[PDB]
Amino acid sequence: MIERRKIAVIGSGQIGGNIAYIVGKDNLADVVLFDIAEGIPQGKALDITHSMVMFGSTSKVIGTNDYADISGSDVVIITASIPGRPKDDRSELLFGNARILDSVAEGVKKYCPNAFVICITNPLDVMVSHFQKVSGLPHNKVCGMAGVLDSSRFRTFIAQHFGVNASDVSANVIGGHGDGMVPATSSVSVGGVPLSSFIKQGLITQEQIDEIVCHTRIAWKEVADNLKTGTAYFAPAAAAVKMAEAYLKDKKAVVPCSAFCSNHYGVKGIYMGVPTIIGKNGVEDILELDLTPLEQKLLGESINEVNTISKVLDNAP
Template identity: 35%
Template sequence: MQKIAIVGAGRVGEAAAQFIAQNDMAREIAMLDVREGAAEGCALDIQETAPLFKFDTRLSGSTDPAILRDAGIIVVTAGIPRKPGMSRSDVLDTNVRIIDEIVDNIMRYAPDAILLFVSNPVDVLTWRAWKRSGLPRERVIGQAGVLDSSRMAAFVALETGLCSCDINAMVLGGHGDSMVPMLRYTTINGIPVDKFLDAQALERIVTRTRGGGAEVLALRKNSSAYDAPGAAVAQMVEAIVTDRKRVLPSVAILQGEYSYPDGAMGVPCVLGKNGLERIVELDLNASETAMFKHSMESVLADIARLH
């Protein structure tokens, strides 16, 4: 891809830019931030790692939204972060105003881009951006499940002592306390995870996965997570740039899938050059269906606040 843009030069945006540049996913990365010098400084800092990591991507930064012009993918990380004790929904009122302005600038300068949202609450803001932009749902997706699934897989590795590379986890639902960790679809080299861990250990993993971001925030106190979210963004971008047709849990606009005619939810998606290429509908048992419904109702309640 010729150009990828990142809106928000905070820690998540910076981490994502570093991973994307380091893996030569685009010839150019453009960073946008409202803070004077923030995007420029971030871009320059990453650019100076190019000789060490042997990449040739060119980075630039600006406060002028015109820098988004002609970007093929735009990653949106801008917004106020959570503070300890805050939920993702607590930042909705402020962040929706920020997202509205960003979407308007995108439609002015890069109306053909694929949009990837990271800003919280990501499910609600992905839906809002889709509505405001008028873009097809294939080009407006959110990052949540890749991060949550990575966290769950990491916790399985820590509990079992087994190699992280062999662990595949799946997390559906909203990106918050009501997310749906799918133990039935979590495996270690194809073997169901419950062959390695008892019910108590699995419950610890589920609880820790749901609070994964809050745990990092509570430990750091002055910063939420950014390395893992940045890596998750890069994995989704890589799937689109290389047209790999990867199955990755992503926030998608539902139009009948999982029995919901509207809304945005983390579900398994096939990602390729067109963005969202297909939603994979899993057969959920009664317990999973109840958790999915609870998660969806939480997202829909936040969406209703926007009307």
């Protein structure tokens, strides 16, 4: 019997509200906006409900403070976080958000244990690992949104240099969602043309490539410093929706995200940004990029960052 698709958004702040907005606009699923703050999800849900007829969507969007309402959710997107932007590093939110995810894990485990969980809450890679351990959900049904955002930024900056449609730039960011993230320049192409060729042709310099890599790594601060009252939320929301689409429509889409990687990239069981295939069984495979020796080292340094913050969490107050 046909049932409507259902996405639960845990945390109805800046990102959560836009996710509901976009999901509703696309008629991808019904949405449940969950939050502990009185009135917030209810007001956003009512507002978004009014827009549905304008978009020609019959998606239902409700606000709640009750985990019972996320029962039967196909996808759970976790945006829940302590207030205030990070000053210097995403891991400043580590202790507070780990405790939030403990609570979220109990709600999910009880009401929708078969859901595909997409974590957004920072510090992303550590939070995803934490959520999986506490919730007990299968590794392939729990992942983190990060790579799509980082890679979209990487692709956009390359596209802005060459003056071409970013959809025609292929480019990946891998590793942890932090300073150590690795935009893999070696496997970048624009319409099938690699960066090495554009260098020979005189259309881009290595220094320009290095600036694009740097820009990608610290892009979050550029947005956050301009917004002042918080961090990026339009693109992170859009990225979460693309990931939800891949699962709900069984796309077998190649998606860079934080996934449990245990037989690739020289690691033996860790959550980190890698190119995955996402479909109706969640994370169905991981693909191995052709990394240079330098890039393999940078990835190693990224893995170290993830392990370091993970150990800090294991010795929390």
